RNA sequence: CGGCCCCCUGGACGAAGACUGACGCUCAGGUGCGAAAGCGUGGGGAGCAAACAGGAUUAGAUACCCUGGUAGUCCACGCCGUAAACGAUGUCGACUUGGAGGUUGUGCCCUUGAGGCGUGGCUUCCGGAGCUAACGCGUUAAGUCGACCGCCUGGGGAGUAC
């Protein structure tokens, strides 16, 4: 009656868009294809690597329950962006955290900087950090024993761009985007971004805040032109990539792979 | 019982490499002398079997006509690409006042008194098609009388 | 495509850096365009058709898509 | 176009209301004074013809104006004829 | 993605030259509403901005010339 | 017999995309939750349980019911749904004029029983590889199209369908020959084919699987009948 | 301009019968009700419903028998280019009697085999079928 | 109709109100505007280029290609009144399923953000019913209707002769 105009709204209330409601049980798997059912129009076609962590197998068996991500609708067939991302979520709530007692505590272990600042990793994402943040001071983790274990305690991020640089070691110790694009500009600033859509001559890797980066088809690899990207490398997937180039007038940055 | 007229039959041709195929089609049209008629258009490398074809066709595929006696219940206009046909009742004793296909086709279909004229093309296969059609679209005095929500001496 | 050698940088990549440039100002193209008069009418025919290409490349094409093709 | 305050001026004089504004006489004055500057501009720029277009549709408006205020009411259109000094 | 929606700028001026300098090429070329994403309706005010200012010699028109 | 809140858990209320829809579903349809149609549950409700009691009679007069659904998702589901029941099914691809041509169909059912007798009942064996390891993949074939109507004999009295826009082509037989259709039909599909038209998610697993079971029930209760 | 308004509702009723749609609503005229009326009255049409004060709206609820429309046909006959009147003895007699013929007599508009009754004719508003 | 600026100037659209009160639609004759080329008189003349000249090509080449090159193109004021002046689709009004855009307003909404929900104008593409000889058109109709006008009646002769 209005029993079904009511259940709407309430459905409507116990329901959002992104992946923040825990909600899809996996109800079948099978390599390399999960799926969940979020109580969304269609079933998920899941990645299988968007689900194992950290050295390979999978985690999770029927009737598991992580939330993926919404405001996509109907390519043709099928429903959602990944739950992977949903994560991400929690990992900035949890560097978000820091903010309330001034300092978030985990592990952050910092070999090298691909891009000015050593790379931490927590759990089972990597991240890059500006040069500052891996070392509270000039000690360098490239006299530590390699792989180090201490915590990140934050040096600087970006804010709208995701780049965070974090503290290894010394416990004690406690319009937008292209107007000033000289920020990863110099020569060969190593970024990690995530792919987006690979076009036959190209593979669209572009993370930094609202910019576009093709590293096109020449690069990629060592071989140049037999080489067809979307064998190569993957589909959605945070890699190696650094500037090479920038226009900030035809916003056209041409990043590289083969580096 | 049905009856069965073959209207019709055309040599048409396929050029080829070699020259030109020839082949034959068959428009027929069949009836039982009441509401039921209907056509068929066959098409076959020799005339017989492309007749049969067509005889086939037609046995499916039939139509009912509401036959107030012999004749048709009102002026029913029927339309199909060029040919487009007019046809009205008529009194006992008249015949079938038709040309051609269309007159086949009536016969069929057992109206014995029409008045009727294809105007415009009057290429067989188009105009018996109108003439199926308007024979179709022909309501009857009930079936008014169940469209409207009324008895039949109220339409009269 | 004003360009200045950086101090230690090679020659070759140099070259490759104006040739990127050119590429960017579409200099040449330009150039080509210029060498002959487009009547009025041929260039709007031709920025019409380009479109008309660029449509059904867009959209029918992803249509075809959608279905597999073995 | 008419400026505002010369519009507002016209409208007060020969609207009864000096709110009313759509008043047929008031919007024949309207277009009178229109055609009146128009001229002006018009004796300068002679091969400026689609401006001359939106004159010659405005002049077109009052005759009609004028015709209707004819068959409703004589005497108002007299009058409006001789304030404005329309020859017809 | 346009700044000037964003912002919400009532008109785009010739007199901040840095902003314009965004919207300019290494060449002195305007830059395609494809590229920067600039809303129509900016764009091609941004662009008559472009004008004046290389009038009043605050932007050039192009590289090479002097 | 299905309740309302069932069909919610499984997903029957979620339809497609906005953009995707046909106007001709606008009377199923309730509203549109996040870009997305949602299908309308006080109206289904009733005109899926009179299709069932339609199914259920024909199955009292001992009626072939016909169980189409190539999306290859609902392709397991659907034929076990058949054999619940004993009844015929279409889980792979729909040859073109199974129905309107049964008669050349039939040839091929012959012969896929022929090959099947051949490979069980003979116990021969003694045959050329080559040769032999084709037959195999021709039995294979013919299982694949023709397995669940190999003992249909001759055309059937009813016909149940998962998606009416995808299997249009055994809809529109069922129309040329005079079948009664009885279709899942989504927001994007056509319901003007089908003769007893059931408003609901046709994509989603679970939901599908629903609209099977309680079929394959009410052909039982019939056939006990 | 609008320049018919009979001819226009009895075009809107028959894109309505076309499009499967249950009700269809127009500006009200005297006239137009009458017609409507008519039409409830020979069994074309559900009801007809005028509502409104100062620019009246009449609605009309169309009739649907077995899938297809009852408003079969629908043309004017009379019409602003070209009237026409007809004698008690020359009015037609629409579909051989039965669909009806709008005429408007001096004793109000009805339907044709209404005004032979009465014996008059008139003016030839529309056929309908 | 296309750099930028100023002066004079016509139309369109939206937002609310307020007013006028059928003043409307269409239009034979009539009047005006009407690309390019062309004409007249007076200016101008960089580039381009009918004509023309030479060089090639060719059987020939009164062409295509090359090197030159004058009317003209440019401005002023007159005339000419035609074009595949095309959407090959008269104007005005009403009514009839949808989708994806573009552009330009405007109302509300926490603009919590580039957004969310509407509501107007103009506009590009696809497609339903229906229509169509088919091709196709398809709420910007070639659908369903009304009002007015223009025009057609086999091909040629001929849009020519008088």
Known sequence: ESFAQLFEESLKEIETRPGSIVRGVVVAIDKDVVLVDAGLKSESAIPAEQFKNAQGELEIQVGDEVDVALDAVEDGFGETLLSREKAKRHEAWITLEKAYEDAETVTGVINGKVKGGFTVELNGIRAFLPGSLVDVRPVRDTLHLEGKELEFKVIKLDQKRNNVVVSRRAVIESED???????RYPEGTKLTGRVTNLTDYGCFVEIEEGVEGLVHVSEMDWTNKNIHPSKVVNVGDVVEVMVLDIDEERRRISLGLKQ | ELQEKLIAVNRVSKTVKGGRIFSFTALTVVGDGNGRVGFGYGKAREVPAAIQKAMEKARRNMIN??????????????????????????????????????????????????LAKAYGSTNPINVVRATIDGLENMNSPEMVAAKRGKSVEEIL | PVIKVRENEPFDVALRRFKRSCEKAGVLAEVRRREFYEKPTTERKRAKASAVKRHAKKLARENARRTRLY | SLSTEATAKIV???GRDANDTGSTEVQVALLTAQINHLQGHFAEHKK????????????????????????????????????????? | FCRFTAEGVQEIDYKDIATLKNYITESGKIVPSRITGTRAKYQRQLARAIKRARYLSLLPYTDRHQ | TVSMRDMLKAGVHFGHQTRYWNPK????????????????????????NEALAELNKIASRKGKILFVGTKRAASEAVKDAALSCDQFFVNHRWLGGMLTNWKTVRQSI??????????????????????????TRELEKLENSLGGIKDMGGLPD??????????????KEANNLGIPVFAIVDTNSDPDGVDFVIPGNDDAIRAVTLYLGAVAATVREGRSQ | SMQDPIADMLTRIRNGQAANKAAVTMPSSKLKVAIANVLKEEGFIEDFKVEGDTKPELELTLKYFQGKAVVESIQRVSRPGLR??????????????????????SKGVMTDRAARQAGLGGEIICYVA
């Open chain 4, 48 to 88: 400026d013809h689609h401006s001359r277009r939106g004159l010659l549709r405005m002049v077109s408006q009052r005759r009609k104006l004028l015709d209707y205020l004819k068959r409703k009411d004589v005497a108002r259109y007299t009058q409006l004829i001789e304030r404005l000094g329309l020859r017809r």
């Open chain 6, 158 to 171: 009813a016909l149940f369908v998962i998606d009416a826009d995808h299997e249009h082509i055994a809809i």
């Open chain 6, 25 to 48: 579903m606008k009377p199923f349809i309730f509203g549109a939750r996040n870009k997305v149609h949602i299908i309308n549950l006080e109206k289904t409700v009733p005109m899926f």
């Open chain 2, 65 to 114: 006509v509401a036959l107030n006696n012999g004749t048709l219940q009102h002026p029913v206009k029927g339309v199909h690409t060029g040919s487009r046909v007019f046809m009205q009742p008529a009194s006992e004793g008249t015949g079938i006042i038709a040309g051609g296909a269309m007159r086949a086709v009536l016969e069929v279909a057992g109206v014995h008194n029409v």
């Open chain 1, 177 to 183: 985007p292209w107007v000033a694009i000289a920020k």
């Open chain 7, 84 to 105: 026409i009147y007809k004698r008690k003895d020359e009015l037609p007699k629409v579909m051989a009697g039965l669909g009806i013929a709008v005429v408007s007599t």
């Open chain 6, 110 to 135: 012959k012969r896929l029983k022929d090959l099947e007798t051949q490979s069980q009942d003979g116990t021969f064996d003694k045959l050329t590889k080559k040769e032999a390891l084709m037959r």
């Open chain 4, 12 to 14: 007060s004089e020969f």
